[PDB]
Amino acid sequence: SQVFGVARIYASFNDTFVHVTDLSGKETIARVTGGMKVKADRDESSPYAAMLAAQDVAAKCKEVGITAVHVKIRATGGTRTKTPGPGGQAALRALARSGLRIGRIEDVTPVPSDST
Amino acid sequence: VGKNKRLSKGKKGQKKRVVDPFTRKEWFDIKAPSTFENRNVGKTLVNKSTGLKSASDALKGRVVEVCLADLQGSEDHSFRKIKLRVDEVQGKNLLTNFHGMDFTTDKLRSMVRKWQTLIEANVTVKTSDDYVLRIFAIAFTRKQANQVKRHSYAQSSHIRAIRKVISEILTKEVQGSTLAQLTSKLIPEVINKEIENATKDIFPLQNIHVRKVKLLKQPKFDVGALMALHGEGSGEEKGKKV
Amino acid sequence: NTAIVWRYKFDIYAKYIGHSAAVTAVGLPNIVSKGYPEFLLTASNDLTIKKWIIPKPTASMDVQIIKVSEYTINALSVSPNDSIFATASYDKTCKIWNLENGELEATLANHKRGLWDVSFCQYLLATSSGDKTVKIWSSVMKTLEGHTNAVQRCSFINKQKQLISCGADGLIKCLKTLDGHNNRLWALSTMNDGDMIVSADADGVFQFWKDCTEQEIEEEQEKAKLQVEQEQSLQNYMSKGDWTNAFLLAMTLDHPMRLFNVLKRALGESRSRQEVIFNEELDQAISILNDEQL
Amino acid sequence: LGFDLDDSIALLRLDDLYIETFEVKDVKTLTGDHLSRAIGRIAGKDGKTKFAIENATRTRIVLADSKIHILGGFTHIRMARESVVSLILGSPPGKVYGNLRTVASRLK
RNA sequence: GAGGUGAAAUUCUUGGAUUUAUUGAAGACUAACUACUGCGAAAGCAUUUGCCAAGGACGUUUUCAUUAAUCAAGAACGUAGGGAUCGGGUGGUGUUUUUUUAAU
RNA sequence: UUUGGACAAACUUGGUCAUUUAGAGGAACUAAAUUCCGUAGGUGAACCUGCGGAAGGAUCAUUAAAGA
């Protein structure tokens, strides 16, 4: 018997977010960023920064009790890159390694229908 | 970030150290409607069941976007995730109902290619209940067998005919049904084959899908009807011993 | 909402209400003659301050009285003379008001980024801002110091120097940083403002600094006196003979030409005189020694 | 996605090589004639400018009709991406050759 | 902590910034389909549905009988050959289609 | 109205002591190895903000068969 969170891995520019939520979407669990692990302000979008960020999220979520994670990668959307950078795959590799069962990898990046 | 960066006049406001909320949170599990199989879809944190913004009414608004392969156990539709609105909380089990449906975007982004034209349709239709749906439909031109030309384009006066007949027949398929019946006839993907059978006369029409059902107005609660969609239940005694 | 005062092991003495949450600095006189002080100067996040009076003992006394003729947000600092207190804050507002009808007497703006603290001694004003320098007022612009980043708080040390905090380290005044902390600091406390304590605090760690290493210049004078003593006795031994302790002083001072001459004379004595290759005292004297000067 | 199979094996072994992707359409909005100029300018002649960026910044790129992909190490991805976005803004290839000589000097 | 860059910085943020979810409002635009394809006198023109007129090609054993062209002034708007494709028509004769509801 | 009053923050003149001065001498000692036009804006021209435009700027892999 396993229970499921939802990753919502944000592969932004100049930053990376990982925060697993229970699969409604309200009760977020352990928001981390790329900034709050590294100390340089130059590579707060580092793949290594996202790696240990996802490691700390995996530790806190195993502490709470969720074992599998439906993972959803979101790029910055809008009229911008529309496609995950390197930090998304870095966090994905990290929390796929770190003892956490992974389900239903997707892409929830917004598409504009030709906005401004 | 670190120690050498900045204080930035926002860290002077002090931190309000620890609340440890996961010792206070509470686990519920979700029961899907009985049109599907495997109605247990997972668990949800809420809050502690106290008064003054209680749990049973801080609940009952949310949605859960579960996958149809996770509901049916069959990987023939790994796409087409649905959204269940949690509606009636009843004894640790969130009884939910249907709220929407959408394709995972990789499926349609791999379906659409060039050298074919795609058709869209969408109607606002009331069911036999008082739900109203902006139900959608996507369609694609089939490269006919024994073809030679690279094109396979629709004449754009066939497009009005295909869109008219597809809006007419799925308007009929909604209006002759209730919402539970609409889910139980949308799950084994049968209005797609109905569109292809009633529309292969005019054009060859590669794979048809519906890809979106958006609810826009809900009738009422009808607690008894929602309990009828799952199974009955009567919460009764536990021993006092004091 | 509040700001309260505690008197007597302690206990509550007087609550004080009426603000927007009072998230700010307080201040007391440094002149108290009777058995109770009479000026509580608090600031607020109403962009205002409030002076009031702490009344007589043997009560509870939750009151609110005197004006808010003010900015209308941190770092309130009181005088030993209690004629002028300081309220420097909030993007280069270095104002000083008069513990009375509070006029706008000599407001200053010579900084670049937001202010962080202001302090001034019992013994003549020093503020500290986000310009990573600390500046000294009298009037106008006496001095500044400057280091790495974001000087949080400063304090005068006993007449004329001052110690500043929170670059990553408690630095005195340039000369003499003290860098035993890791993260940010909001703490600087002295005993009698020139004497043997100053306590500072990081997020977690306490650093108690005893300021009792100014006998180190005394023992450094003792070191130089020792050096000239067993340097001149080397010349005395070279001129008087008894080459053994002359060798000892020459080796401990590493004077190589006098070393060469002292053991040349020792060697000539050993060739002239009559297991043993120098005089035997010098033999055991180089026998005993340790490794580094060996 | 479009790299060759030895390049994908190079992603399989030595796990710290990631794969960035972006589009032509994000910068300067690139109407179709200028888009043809853009992909012809990035490919050069007989793939020579693309192979120059490949051998210079220790990474390997592939490019579809409007969306390109670079795989390698992360700061080499960033170096190749800034050289590509300068070239797609439109620069003399001699100037981007000199810039890549400087970036190869940073590489050594 | 967020932003932002080659690094920064400004700014925002414990009155909860970024992110997450449920909505609601506002204007603009019509992602992929998109091509050496379509239209319009030209500039230009891409969501659906309806109305209002117009236009082009084709079809034609229908009518009129030189009504044509060319432009100042003025006016409105701003050398021969072959393959493939789009629109229309004719013929062929296989699969898609289907049959007493209409259509083609 | 002060019956009447020690004092009382700041000042005047001198002294008393100290701080740096600021540079100018004197005379001692120690040390001394990508381009351009039109519409609009301002920077002195250029150049630049934003829009419509012509590249006279140099296309490599990938392409309709799949037999569970």
Short mmCIF file of N, CA, C and O in Angstrom, two decimals, chain D:
data_model
loop_
_atom_site.label_atom_id
_atom_site.label_comp_id
_atom_site.label_asym_id
_atom_site.label_seq_id
_atom_site.Cartn_x
_atom_site.Cartn_y
_atom_site.Cartn_z
N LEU D 1 14.53 12.28 -29.53
CA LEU D 1 14.45 13.72 -29.70
C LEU D 1 15.32 14.19 -30.85
O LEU D 1 15.00 15.19 -31.49
N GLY D 2 16.39 13.47 -31.16
CA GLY D 2 17.05 13.77 -32.42
C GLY D 2 18.55 13.64 -32.48
O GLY D 2 19.12 13.67 -33.57
N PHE D 3 19.20 13.49 -31.34
CA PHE D 3 20.63 13.23 -31.34
C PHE D 3 20.91 11.82 -31.82
O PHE D 3 20.03 10.96 -31.84
N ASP D 4 22.15 11.59 -32.23
CA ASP D 4 22.50 10.27 -32.71
C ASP D 4 22.69 9.31 -31.54
O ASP D 4 22.75 9.71 -30.38
N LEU D 5 22.80 8.02 -31.86
CA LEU D 5 22.75 7.00 -30.82
C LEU D 5 24.04 6.94 -30.02
O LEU D 5 24.00 6.59 -28.83
N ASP D 6 25.18 7.31 -30.61
CA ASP D 6 26.40 7.40 -29.81
C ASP D 6 26.34 8.59 -28.87
O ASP D 6 26.86 8.53 -27.75
N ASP D 7 25.68 9.67 -29.29
CA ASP D 7 25.47 10.82 -28.42
C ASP D 7 24.53 10.47 -27.28
O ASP D 7 24.72 10.92 -26.14
N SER D 8 23.54 9.64 -27.56
CA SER D 8 22.62 9.24 -26.51
C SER D 8 23.29 8.27 -25.54
O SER D 8 23.03 8.32 -24.34
N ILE D 9 24.19 7.41 -26.04
CA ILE D 9 25.00 6.57 -25.16
C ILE D 9 25.91 7.43 -24.30
O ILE D 9 26.15 7.14 -23.12
N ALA D 10 26.40 8.54 -24.87
CA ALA D 10 27.16 9.50 -24.09
C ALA D 10 26.31 10.23 -23.06
O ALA D 10 26.86 10.79 -22.11
N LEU D 11 25.00 10.28 -23.26
CA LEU D 11 24.13 10.74 -22.18
C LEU D 11 23.87 9.64 -21.16
O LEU D 11 23.66 9.93 -19.98
N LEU D 12 23.88 8.38 -21.59
CA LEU D 12 23.61 7.27 -20.69
C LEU D 12 24.75 7.06 -19.71
O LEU D 12 24.56 7.12 -18.49
N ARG D 13 25.94 6.79 -20.22
CA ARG D 13 27.13 6.87 -19.39
C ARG D 13 27.37 8.33 -19.03
O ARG D 13 26.91 9.23 -19.74
N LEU D 14 28.09 8.55 -17.93
CA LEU D 14 28.53 9.88 -17.49
C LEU D 14 27.32 10.80 -17.25
O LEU D 14 27.04 11.74 -17.99
N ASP D 15 26.58 10.45 -16.19
CA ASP D 15 25.19 10.86 -16.00
C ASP D 15 24.97 12.35 -15.84
O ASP D 15 23.81 12.78 -15.82
N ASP D 16 26.02 13.17 -15.74
CA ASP D 16 25.85 14.59 -15.44
C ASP D 16 25.70 15.45 -16.69
O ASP D 16 25.90 16.67 -16.62
N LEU D 17 25.34 14.86 -17.83
CA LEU D 17 25.10 15.61 -19.06
C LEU D 17 23.60 15.75 -19.26
O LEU D 17 22.89 14.75 -19.42
N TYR D 18 23.12 16.99 -19.26
CA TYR D 18 21.71 17.29 -19.45
C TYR D 18 21.48 17.88 -20.83
O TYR D 18 22.41 18.15 -21.60
N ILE D 19 20.20 18.10 -21.12
CA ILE D 19 19.70 18.29 -22.47
C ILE D 19 18.71 19.45 -22.53
O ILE D 19 17.54 19.32 -22.17
N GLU D 20 19.19 20.60 -22.95
CA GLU D 20 18.37 21.79 -23.00
C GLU D 20 17.73 21.93 -24.37
O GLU D 20 18.26 21.44 -25.37
N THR D 21 16.59 22.60 -24.40
CA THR D 21 15.81 22.77 -25.61
C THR D 21 15.23 24.17 -25.63
O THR D 21 14.68 24.62 -24.62
N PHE D 22 15.32 24.86 -26.77
CA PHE D 22 14.55 26.09 -26.90
C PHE D 22 14.14 26.25 -28.36
O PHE D 22 14.31 25.34 -29.17
N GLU D 23 13.57 27.40 -28.67
CA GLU D 23 12.88 27.63 -29.93
C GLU D 23 13.45 28.85 -30.64
O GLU D 23 14.11 29.70 -30.04
N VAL D 24 13.18 28.92 -31.94
CA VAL D 24 13.51 30.11 -32.71
C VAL D 24 12.51 31.22 -32.41
O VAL D 24 12.87 32.40 -32.35
N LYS D 25 11.25 30.85 -32.17
CA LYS D 25 10.13 31.79 -32.12
C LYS D 25 10.14 32.70 -30.91
O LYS D 25 9.35 33.65 -30.87
N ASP D 26 10.99 32.45 -29.91
CA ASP D 26 10.93 33.28 -28.71
C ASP D 26 11.60 34.63 -28.90
O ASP D 26 11.16 35.63 -28.31
N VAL D 27 12.66 34.70 -29.72
CA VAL D 27 13.42 35.92 -29.92
C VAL D 27 13.17 36.43 -31.33
O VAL D 27 13.23 35.67 -32.30
N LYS D 28 12.79 37.71 -31.44
CA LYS D 28 12.62 38.50 -32.65
C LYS D 28 11.51 38.01 -33.59
O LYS D 28 11.37 38.56 -34.69
N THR D 29 10.78 36.95 -33.23
CA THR D 29 9.48 36.52 -33.74
C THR D 29 9.51 35.96 -35.17
O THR D 29 8.56 35.28 -35.58
N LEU D 30 10.61 36.20 -35.91
CA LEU D 30 11.17 35.36 -36.99
C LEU D 30 10.13 34.85 -37.99
O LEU D 30 9.77 33.67 -38.00
N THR D 31 9.61 35.78 -38.80
CA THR D 31 8.78 35.41 -39.94
C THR D 31 9.56 34.50 -40.90
O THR D 31 10.79 34.53 -40.96
N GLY D 32 8.80 33.73 -41.70
CA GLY D 32 9.30 32.47 -42.25
C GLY D 32 10.51 32.59 -43.17
O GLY D 32 11.38 31.71 -43.16
N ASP D 33 10.59 33.67 -43.94
CA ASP D 33 11.78 33.93 -44.75
C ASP D 33 13.00 34.14 -43.87
O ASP D 33 14.05 33.52 -44.08
N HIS D 34 12.86 34.97 -42.83
CA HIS D 34 13.93 35.16 -41.87
C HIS D 34 14.21 33.90 -41.07
O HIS D 34 15.33 33.69 -40.62
N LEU D 35 13.21 33.03 -40.91
CA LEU D 35 13.43 31.75 -40.24
C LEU D 35 14.31 30.84 -41.08
O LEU D 35 15.16 30.12 -40.55
N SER D 36 14.10 30.86 -42.40
CA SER D 36 14.97 30.12 -43.30
C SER D 36 16.39 30.68 -43.26
O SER D 36 17.36 29.91 -43.24
N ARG D 37 16.51 32.02 -43.22
CA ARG D 37 17.83 32.64 -43.02
C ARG D 37 18.45 32.21 -41.70
O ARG D 37 19.66 31.99 -41.63
N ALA D 38 17.63 32.04 -40.67
CA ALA D 38 18.13 31.71 -39.34
C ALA D 38 18.69 30.29 -39.30
O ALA D 38 19.81 30.07 -38.82
N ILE D 39 17.92 29.32 -39.80
CA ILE D 39 18.43 27.95 -39.72
C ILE D 39 19.56 27.73 -40.71
O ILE D 39 20.50 26.98 -40.43
N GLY D 40 19.53 28.42 -41.86
CA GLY D 40 20.67 28.35 -42.76
C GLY D 40 21.91 29.00 -42.20
O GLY D 40 23.03 28.55 -42.47
N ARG D 41 21.74 30.04 -41.39
CA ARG D 41 22.86 30.72 -40.77
C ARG D 41 23.45 29.90 -39.64
O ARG D 41 24.67 29.91 -39.44
N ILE D 42 22.61 29.19 -38.89
CA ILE D 42 23.12 28.34 -37.82
C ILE D 42 23.80 27.10 -38.40
O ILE D 42 24.87 26.69 -37.94
N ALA D 43 23.22 26.52 -39.45
CA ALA D 43 23.85 25.35 -40.05
C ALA D 43 25.07 25.72 -40.89
O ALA D 43 25.93 24.86 -41.10
N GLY D 44 25.16 26.95 -41.36
CA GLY D 44 26.33 27.36 -42.13
C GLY D 44 26.27 26.82 -43.54
O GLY D 44 25.28 27.00 -44.24
N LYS D 45 27.34 26.15 -43.96
CA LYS D 45 27.37 25.44 -45.23
C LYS D 45 27.99 24.08 -44.99
O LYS D 45 29.11 24.00 -44.47
N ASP D 46 27.26 23.03 -45.36
CA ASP D 46 27.60 21.63 -45.08
C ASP D 46 27.81 21.39 -43.59
O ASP D 46 28.72 20.67 -43.17
N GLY D 47 26.95 22.00 -42.77
CA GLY D 47 26.97 21.79 -41.34
C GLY D 47 28.17 22.36 -40.61
O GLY D 47 28.42 21.98 -39.47
N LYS D 48 28.88 23.30 -41.23
CA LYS D 48 30.21 23.64 -40.73
C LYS D 48 30.17 24.55 -39.50
O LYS D 48 30.98 24.37 -38.59
N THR D 49 29.21 25.47 -39.41
CA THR D 49 29.13 26.31 -38.23
C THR D 49 28.59 25.53 -37.04
O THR D 49 29.04 25.71 -35.90
N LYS D 50 27.63 24.63 -37.29
CA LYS D 50 27.11 23.77 -36.24
C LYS D 50 28.20 22.84 -35.72
O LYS D 50 28.34 22.65 -34.51
N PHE D 51 29.02 22.29 -36.62
CA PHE D 51 30.12 21.45 -36.17
C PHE D 51 31.21 22.26 -35.49
O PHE D 51 31.91 21.73 -34.62
N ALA D 52 31.34 23.54 -35.84
CA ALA D 52 32.27 24.41 -35.13
C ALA D 52 31.83 24.63 -33.69
O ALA D 52 32.65 24.54 -32.77
N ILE D 53 30.54 24.89 -33.48
CA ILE D 53 30.03 25.04 -32.11
C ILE D 53 30.14 23.72 -31.35
O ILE D 53 30.48 23.70 -30.16
N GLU D 54 29.90 22.61 -32.05
CA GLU D 54 30.01 21.27 -31.47
C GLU D 54 31.42 20.99 -30.96
O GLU D 54 31.60 20.64 -29.79
N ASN D 55 32.42 21.15 -31.82
CA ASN D 55 33.79 20.88 -31.40
C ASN D 55 34.33 21.95 -30.47
O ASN D 55 35.28 21.68 -29.73
N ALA D 56 33.75 23.14 -30.47
CA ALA D 56 34.25 24.19 -29.59
C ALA D 56 33.77 23.99 -28.17
O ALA D 56 34.58 23.82 -27.25
N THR D 57 32.46 24.01 -27.96
CA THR D 57 31.93 24.08 -26.60
C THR D 57 31.68 22.72 -25.98
O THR D 57 30.88 22.64 -25.04
N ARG D 58 32.33 21.66 -26.49
CA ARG D 58 32.34 20.31 -25.90
C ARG D 58 30.95 19.74 -25.70
O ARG D 58 30.70 18.99 -24.76
N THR D 59 30.02 20.12 -26.58
CA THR D 59 28.64 19.71 -26.50
C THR D 59 28.18 19.31 -27.88
O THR D 59 28.92 19.45 -28.86
N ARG D 60 26.94 18.84 -28.00
CA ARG D 60 26.44 18.40 -29.30
C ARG D 60 25.02 18.87 -29.47
O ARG D 60 24.20 18.74 -28.56
N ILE D 61 24.73 19.46 -30.63
CA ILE D 61 23.42 20.05 -30.84
C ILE D 61 22.73 19.32 -31.98
O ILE D 61 23.37 18.63 -32.79
N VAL D 62 21.41 19.42 -32.00
CA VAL D 62 20.60 19.05 -33.15
C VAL D 62 19.53 20.11 -33.25
O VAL D 62 19.24 20.83 -32.29
N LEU D 63 18.96 20.26 -34.44
CA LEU D 63 18.04 21.37 -34.65
C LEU D 63 16.97 20.97 -35.64
O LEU D 63 17.27 20.56 -36.77
N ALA D 64 15.72 21.06 -35.21
CA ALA D 64 14.56 20.82 -36.06
C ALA D 64 14.25 22.10 -36.82
O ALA D 64 15.07 23.02 -36.91
N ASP D 65 13.05 22.17 -37.40
CA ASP D 65 12.71 23.30 -38.26
C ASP D 65 12.51 24.59 -37.47
O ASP D 65 12.74 25.68 -38.00
N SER D 66 12.08 24.50 -36.21
CA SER D 66 11.92 25.69 -35.40
C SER D 66 12.34 25.52 -33.95
O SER D 66 12.16 26.44 -33.16
N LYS D 67 12.89 24.37 -33.58
CA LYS D 67 13.19 24.07 -32.19
C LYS D 67 14.51 23.32 -32.14
O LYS D 67 14.67 22.31 -32.82
N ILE D 68 15.46 23.83 -31.36
CA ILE D 68 16.79 23.23 -31.32
C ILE D 68 17.05 22.69 -29.92
O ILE D 68 16.41 23.08 -28.93
N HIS D 69 18.00 21.76 -29.85
CA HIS D 69 18.32 21.01 -28.64
C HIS D 69 19.83 20.91 -28.53
O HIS D 69 20.51 20.63 -29.52
N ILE D 70 20.36 21.14 -27.33
CA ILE D 70 21.78 21.06 -27.04
C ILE D 70 21.98 20.12 -25.87
O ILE D 70 21.38 20.33 -24.81
N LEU D 71 22.82 19.09 -26.02
CA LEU D 71 23.14 18.26 -24.87
C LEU D 71 24.62 18.36 -24.53
O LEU D 71 25.47 18.54 -25.41
N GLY D 72 24.90 18.25 -23.24
CA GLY D 72 26.27 18.36 -22.74
C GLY D 72 26.27 18.64 -21.25
O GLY D 72 25.34 18.28 -20.54
N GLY D 73 27.35 19.27 -20.79
CA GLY D 73 27.40 19.76 -19.43
C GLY D 73 26.80 21.14 -19.33
O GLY D 73 26.70 21.82 -20.34
N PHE D 74 26.43 21.55 -18.11
CA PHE D 74 25.48 22.65 -17.94
C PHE D 74 26.06 24.00 -18.37
O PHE D 74 25.39 24.76 -19.08
N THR D 75 27.28 24.34 -17.96
CA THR D 75 27.80 25.63 -18.39
C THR D 75 28.22 25.60 -19.85
O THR D 75 28.23 26.65 -20.50
N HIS D 76 28.49 24.42 -20.41
CA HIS D 76 28.74 24.33 -21.84
C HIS D 76 27.46 24.50 -22.63
O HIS D 76 27.48 25.05 -23.73
N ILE D 77 26.34 24.03 -22.06
CA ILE D 77 25.02 24.33 -22.60
C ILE D 77 24.80 25.83 -22.62
O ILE D 77 24.34 26.39 -23.62
N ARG D 78 25.17 26.52 -21.53
CA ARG D 78 24.96 27.96 -21.48
C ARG D 78 25.85 28.71 -22.47
O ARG D 78 25.41 29.68 -23.10
N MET D 79 27.10 28.26 -22.64
CA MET D 79 28.00 28.89 -23.61
C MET D 79 27.50 28.69 -25.04
O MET D 79 27.46 29.64 -25.84
N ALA D 80 27.10 27.46 -25.37
CA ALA D 80 26.56 27.18 -26.69
C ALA D 80 25.26 27.92 -26.92
O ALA D 80 25.01 28.40 -28.04
N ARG D 81 24.45 28.09 -25.88
CA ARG D 81 23.17 28.77 -26.03
C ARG D 81 23.37 30.26 -26.27
O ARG D 81 22.66 30.86 -27.07
N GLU D 82 24.36 30.87 -25.60
CA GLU D 82 24.56 32.29 -25.84
C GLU D 82 25.21 32.53 -27.20
O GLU D 82 24.88 33.52 -27.87
N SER D 83 26.06 31.61 -27.66
CA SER D 83 26.62 31.74 -29.01
C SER D 83 25.54 31.55 -30.07
O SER D 83 25.51 32.27 -31.08
N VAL D 84 24.63 30.60 -29.85
CA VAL D 84 23.55 30.36 -30.79
C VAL D 84 22.57 31.52 -30.81
O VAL D 84 22.12 31.94 -31.88
N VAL D 85 22.27 32.11 -29.65
CA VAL D 85 21.29 33.19 -29.65
C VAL D 85 21.91 34.47 -30.21
O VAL D 85 21.22 35.27 -30.84
N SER D 86 23.24 34.64 -30.08
CA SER D 86 23.89 35.75 -30.78
C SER D 86 23.87 35.54 -32.29
O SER D 86 23.58 36.48 -33.05
N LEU D 87 24.13 34.31 -32.74
CA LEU D 87 24.12 34.03 -34.17
C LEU D 87 22.71 34.12 -34.75
O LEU D 87 22.54 34.48 -35.92
N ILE D 88 21.69 33.80 -33.95
CA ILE D 88 20.32 33.87 -34.45
C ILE D 88 19.77 35.28 -34.34
O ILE D 88 18.82 35.63 -35.04
N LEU D 89 20.37 36.12 -33.48
CA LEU D 89 20.13 37.54 -33.59
C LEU D 89 20.77 38.08 -34.86
O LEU D 89 20.27 39.04 -35.46
N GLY D 90 21.87 37.47 -35.29
CA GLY D 90 22.42 37.74 -36.60
C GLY D 90 23.73 38.50 -36.52
O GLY D 90 23.74 39.72 -36.36
N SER D 91 24.82 37.77 -36.64
CA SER D 91 26.16 38.30 -36.46
C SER D 91 27.04 37.78 -37.58
O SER D 91 26.68 36.80 -38.24
N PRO D 92 28.15 38.44 -37.86
CA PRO D 92 29.13 37.87 -38.78
C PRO D 92 29.73 36.59 -38.23
O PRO D 92 30.15 36.53 -37.06
N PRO D 93 29.75 35.53 -39.05
CA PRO D 93 30.33 34.26 -38.61
C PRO D 93 31.81 34.34 -38.27
O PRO D 93 32.28 33.55 -37.45
N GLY D 94 32.55 35.28 -38.86
CA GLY D 94 33.91 35.51 -38.41
C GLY D 94 33.97 36.02 -36.98
O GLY D 94 34.83 35.61 -36.19
N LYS D 95 33.02 36.90 -36.62
CA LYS D 95 32.97 37.41 -35.25
C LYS D 95 32.57 36.31 -34.27
O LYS D 95 33.13 36.23 -33.17
N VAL D 96 31.64 35.44 -34.67
CA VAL D 96 31.30 34.36 -33.74
C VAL D 96 32.39 33.29 -33.73
O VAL D 96 32.56 32.62 -32.71
N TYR D 97 33.20 33.18 -34.79
CA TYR D 97 34.37 32.31 -34.74
C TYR D 97 35.40 32.83 -33.75
O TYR D 97 35.96 32.06 -32.98
N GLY D 98 35.64 34.15 -33.76
CA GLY D 98 36.57 34.72 -32.79
C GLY D 98 36.06 34.61 -31.36
O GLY D 98 36.84 34.33 -30.43
N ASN D 99 34.75 34.80 -31.17
CA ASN D 99 34.15 34.62 -29.85
C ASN D 99 34.28 33.17 -29.39
O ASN D 99 34.55 32.91 -28.21
N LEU D 100 34.15 32.22 -30.31
CA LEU D 100 34.32 30.83 -29.91
C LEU D 100 35.79 30.46 -29.72
O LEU D 100 36.07 29.52 -28.98
N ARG D 101 36.72 31.18 -30.35
CA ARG D 101 38.12 31.02 -29.99
C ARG D 101 38.37 31.46 -28.56
O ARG D 101 39.10 30.79 -27.81
N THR D 102 37.75 32.57 -28.15
CA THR D 102 37.89 33.00 -26.76
C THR D 102 37.22 32.03 -25.79
O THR D 102 37.76 31.75 -24.71
N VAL D 103 36.07 31.47 -26.17
CA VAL D 103 35.40 30.52 -25.28
C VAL D 103 36.15 29.19 -25.23
O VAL D 103 36.22 28.55 -24.18
N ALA D 104 36.80 28.80 -26.33
CA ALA D 104 37.67 27.63 -26.27
C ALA D 104 38.92 27.89 -25.43
O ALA D 104 39.45 26.97 -24.80
N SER D 105 39.39 29.14 -25.40
CA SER D 105 40.47 29.49 -24.48
C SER D 105 40.01 29.44 -23.03
O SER D 105 40.80 29.12 -22.14
N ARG D 106 38.75 29.78 -22.77
CA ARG D 106 38.18 29.55 -21.44
C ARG D 106 38.06 28.07 -21.14
O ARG D 106 38.17 27.65 -19.98
N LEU D 107 37.81 27.26 -22.18
CA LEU D 107 37.69 25.81 -22.00
C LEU D 107 39.03 25.19 -21.63
O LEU D 107 39.09 24.32 -20.75
N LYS D 108 40.10 25.61 -22.29
CA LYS D 108 41.43 25.12 -21.93
C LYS D 108 41.85 25.74 -20.59
O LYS D 108 41.81 25.08 -19.55
#
